[PDB]
Amino acid sequence: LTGYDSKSSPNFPNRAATRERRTVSFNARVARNKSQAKKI
């Protein structure tokens, strides 16, 4: 095993709450790390 733990990366998509956030900030948190492969 690598370290003391194996927590996931913050670069992984769908990691924040997205429960009762604003419509400006809801759309920012669903497309967190998906923009690259859509354009690839």
């Binding site: 913050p10 990691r15 924040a16 709450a17 956030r21 604003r22 400006v24 900030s25 759309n27 920012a28 948190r29």
Partner: protein, 324 residues
């Protein structure tokens, strides 16, 4: 104005008035072209919060032109602005390179997160990232963990929250908030517990020792005390501050016991008169009547009213009385 009972409110009279008014919420993804008069308010509100009422001259600000341009483009407040701003040189100059490591952690909790490190493990969780991965990943750990995303939004400026019950820290970290944030007309360089050169909550932040809260603007707002341990194992000196315990037979005789803190002790204004003495002005060792201002006392109830008159009739002023 001071007090806790006048306007049926108590937090806006501890120096948190102007902080209790603002939101700065950035109601759109990108900044609208053609105009700047709305996002300039968002930019400058982020500057006064993240740098902590610091002055940034217009040549110092012009170093950070690139960043302010991407945030005004289609990028976000926390990761593209507040994380970029804390990796500039105008941030690292004041809060990182001037201090030891624990001064940097206490100011990143205050600036980025708006609260206080309570306990040794909040320090150690952030200290260990610097030793293995340098500064540029040490700032990331204040952002890309599970505290920032659930409290502040993607486009809200990180307001202060270390005083309220929702930040589930402690009640000792409540008193530590009113040592860091000493009002609204104050900065980090401009408060007498950290002059941008030291660690503000060093012994009290590690051991979670609660402090007496002294309101900014009160008569006795200049109270500051120095630190020395006592006891022969840690090789310390007796006689600097007062104890915080009131342990013995003097605890419950003369009533219950309190801890009083005085600040202003000058050489004139001791005797039972109105004027200074004239003559030699000092004894043969020429120290002072009070070799340092900011004396603290431990006193019972039945000796509280004679002590009070000894404090005030000899020039001192009372900063805080807490029961022990």
């Amino acid at each position: 104005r001071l007090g806790t009972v006048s306007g049926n409110s108590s937090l806006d009279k501890l120096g948190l008035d102007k902080f209790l008014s603002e939101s700065n919420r950035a109601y759109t993804p990108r900044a609208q072209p053609g105009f700047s008069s709305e996002y300039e308010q968002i930019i400058s509100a982020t500057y006064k919060q993240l740098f902590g009422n610091a002055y940034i001259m217009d040549s110092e600000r012009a170093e950070m032109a690139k960043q302010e341009s991407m945030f005004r483009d289609g990028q976000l407040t926390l990761k593209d602005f507040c994380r970029a701003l804390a990796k500039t040189e105008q941030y690292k100059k004041r809060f990182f390179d001037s201090r030891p490591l624990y001064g940097a952690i206490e100011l990143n909790f205050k600036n980025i997160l708006g609260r206080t490190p309570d306990g040794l493990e909040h320090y150690r969780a952030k200290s260990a990232v610097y030793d293995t991965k340098g500064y540029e990943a040490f700032v990331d750990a204040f952002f890309d963990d599970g505290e920032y995303d659930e409290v502040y939004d993607d486009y809200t400026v990180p307001f202060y929250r270390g005083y309220k019950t929702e930040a589930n820290l402690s009640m000792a970290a409540f008193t530590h908030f009113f040592r860091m944030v000493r009002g609204s007309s104050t900065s980090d360089k401009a408060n007498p517990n950290s002059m941008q050169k030291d660690i503000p909550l060093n012994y009290y932040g590690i051991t979670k020792t609660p402090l007496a809260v002294i309101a900014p603007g009160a008569a006795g707002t200049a109270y500051t005390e120095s630190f020395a341990g006592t006891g022969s194992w840690q090789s310390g000196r007796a006689g600097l501050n007062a104890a915080r315990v009131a342990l013995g037979v003097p605890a419950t005789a003369n009533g219950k016991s309190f801890r009083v803190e005085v600040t202003g002790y000058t050489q004139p204004g001791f005797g039972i008169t109105a004027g200074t003495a004239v003559g030699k002005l000092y004894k043969a060792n020429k120290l002072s009547r009070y070799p340092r201002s900011n004396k603290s006392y431990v006193v019972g109830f039945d000796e509280l009213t004679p002590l009070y008159q000894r404090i005030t009739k000899n020039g001192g002023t009372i900063a805080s009385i807490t029961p022990l």
